Amino acid sequence: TTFAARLNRLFDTVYPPGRGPHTSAEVIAALKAEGITMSAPYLSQLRSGNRTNPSGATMAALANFFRIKAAYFTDDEYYEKLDKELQWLCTMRDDGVRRIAQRAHGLPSAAQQKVLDRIDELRRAEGID
Amino acid sequence: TTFAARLNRLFDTVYPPGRGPHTSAEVIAALKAEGITMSAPYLSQLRSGNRTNPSGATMAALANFFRIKAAYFTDDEYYEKLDKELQWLCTMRDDGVRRIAQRAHGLPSAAQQKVLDRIDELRRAEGI
């Protein structure tokens, strides 16, 4: 929940289909495309963490870039109100979870539950739980 | 499957997190902000299909907004490779499968397999 934390978070979960995440320069690019002078290193130093605490414009820019609200960055709660769906994304990019979802999509609720229950058996078994 | 639909297919699949599908108006405005200009009711009739076969450049600026490639409208290869994969959501979203899918993410490589195995063990109990 540093700046660079929630920032990179975006960088790793929000991006167009058939496609990987945006580059820093891809962001910088879009930033000049709406007329915004942010130095490309000024992205890096902030993603690394060399001097956190950026200004609101500096924040609202890249919130509006990813097309989410900058309350994400400020309000610790919206961060959490969001991150659910936001995590949820990097969930469904996972083959395995895909395969599973696919297969178990045709069982009855009753049988799909055993799956859910079987799932639990294995997280416990891994020390996940 | 025609532009008026392919463009309508996009508003209803591609939209940002914690957000509703994209709006035509906010589509026009967002382009304008680039310095890029486009009519409101052109698009409206465009989406109605009351004016098809648009500028090669009209398609581009428009894909650019949705952050996808322009081929989505021309190239059906890229398309089917998408919208059916874009069709993943509603079938794999809010189903109850939601939890099954989101619990299962944490799992290790071997574990997910045991779950794949467990499913056929359950399908078999019906017919497979």
Which CATH number characterizes residue B45's domain?
1.10.260.40
Q: In B, which residues are within 8 Å of A106 by CB distance?
A: 123
Look up residue B103 and give its amino acid: R
Which of A66, A103, A123 is nearest residue B116 as measured by Cβ atoms? A103
Q: Is A105 on the interface with B (CB under 8 A)?
A: yes
Give this entry's resolution in angstroms. 3.3
The CA R_g of chain A, rounded to the nearest whole Å, is 19
Q: How far apart are CA A46 and CA B87, in angstroms?
A: 36
Residue of B nearest to A127 (CA): B107
DSSP letters for chain B = --HHHHHHHHHTT---TTSPPPPHHHHHHHHHTTT----HHHHHHHHHTSS-S--HHHHHHHHHHHTS-THHHH-HHHHHHHHHHHTHHHHTSSSSHHHHHHHTTSS-HHHHHHHHHHHHHHHTTT--
The label of the residue with tokens 């997910």 reads B112
Which residue in the set B67, B88, B122 is minimally distant from A111, CB to CB?
A: B122
Within 4-43 of A, beta carbons closer than 8 Å to B belong to 14-19, 33-35
Quick one: three-class SS letters along B62-94?
HHHHHCCCCHHHHCHHHHHHHHHHHCHHHHCCC
Q: Is B86 on the interface with A (CB under 8 A)?
A: yes
Q: Which residue of A has its CA nearest to B116?
A: A100
Cβ-based neighbours of A1, under 8 Å, separated by 6 or more:
A76, A79
| Gyration radius from chain B CA atoms | 20
Number of domains in chain B: 1
Nearest to A36 by CA among A65, A77, A68: A65
Q: How far apart are CA A10 and CA A63, in angstroms?
A: 9
Q: Which segments of chain A does DSSP mark as H helices, in order?
A: 3-13, 24-32, 40-48, 56-66, 71-74, 76-92, 97-103, 109-124
Task: Name the residue range of residue B22's domain.
Answer: 1-128
Chain B residue whose CA is closest to A35 = B34
Spell out a b/e string for A98-116, using b for 16 or more CB atoms within 10 Å of the CB, else e.
bbbbbbbeebeeebbebbb
- Give the integer Cα–Cα distance in Å for A6 and A79: 8
Contact B62, B14 (CB under 8 A): no
> Among candidates A95, A125, A34, which has minimal Cα distance to B34?
A34
Residue among B67, B111, B122 minimizing CB distance to A107: B122
Q: What is the crossing angle of helices B3-11 and B40-48, to 10°?
A: 110
